Structure formats: C-alpha cells, structure tokens
C-alpha cells in the first residue's frame, strides 16, 4: 500500500460506503477493471461505471465524469492513468464523495494530496476486490 491506513481503516471503508463511481470502466471481461467492478456487484455493491470511451458497461449507463451521475456517491475508485487522476479527483470533491480510491498503478502525489486536502480519504496501491477477500473474507466452498 502506498497510503497509510490501517487493515481497520480500509475495512470500515467496504463496510460503510456502498455507493461506488468506478472510473475506467471496461466491458472487457479480461480487464481488471472489469473484474473489480463484477466482483462489488455481486457483493451487494451500487457501482456506477464512469468511461467517457464507452456507453454502457455490464448493463449499467456509462458516463463521461462522475459529475453526470444523478445519485449519490461515496467512493470514486480508479483505473486510469496517474496523470488523468487530478481530474476525477477534482469532481470527485465536487461530488461530495467520501474516499478516493486508486487501484494498482493509478496512484498520483499531487492527486492525492489535493482529495486529501479538501478532506477525503485516500486509499493508494490497494483493489477494492483484493481487500475484500482480504479483509471482509468468507470460506470459499461452504
């Protein structure tokens, strides 16, 4: 992990923010954002894909900015670029949402820093689904 929270900190933030605006979403079954975005769905999680490339992803409408997203949202989780991370970070603060998460490769100092500033939590070099499995684990043949 980059960030400097604690396995309690990042188990509090799966257990209370169900609303998620994943940005990078892909229809790529083969693409780890794919995957992540299957995985939180199927583990009671409101997941709003945000891509500006594509249309729809996994049967749900996919926006451009989380901005366009009519309801609430609570963690912005990212699969972009470390250079584009500024902006969805901006609206994510804009958005009024609680925690910025960035997946593996994502992390941006400068990005960071700013969400951090304007007083959300920053999760860096984590996956949603790996910390799930992790953290808020379950036998996996009962």
């Not at 929270?5 to 780890?32: M, N, Q």
């Not at 670029?81 to 960035?102: H, L, S, T």
Request: some cysteine; hydrophobic content about 40%.
């Amino acid at each position: 992990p980059i960030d400097g929270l604690t396995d309690e900190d990042i188990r509090e933030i799966l257990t209370r923010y169900k609303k998620i605006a994943l940005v990078g979403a892909s229809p790529k079954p083969e693409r780890d954002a794919n995957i992540v975005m299957k995985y939180l769905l199927e583990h009671g999680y409101d997941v709003y894909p945000v891509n500006p490339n594509y249309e729809e992803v996994l049967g749900r409408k996919c926006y451009p900015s989380v901005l366009d997203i009519p309801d609430k949202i609570e963690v912005v989780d990212l699969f972009v670029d470390p250079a584009k991370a500024w902006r969805f970070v901006v609206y994510a603060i804009k958005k009024g949402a609680k925690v910025v998460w960035f997946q593996y490769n994502t992390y941006y100092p400068l990005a960071a820093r700013q969400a951090k500033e304007a007083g959300l939590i920053i999760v860096a070099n984590r996956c949603m689904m790996r910390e799930h499995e992790r953290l808020l684990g379950e036998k996996l043949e009962h």
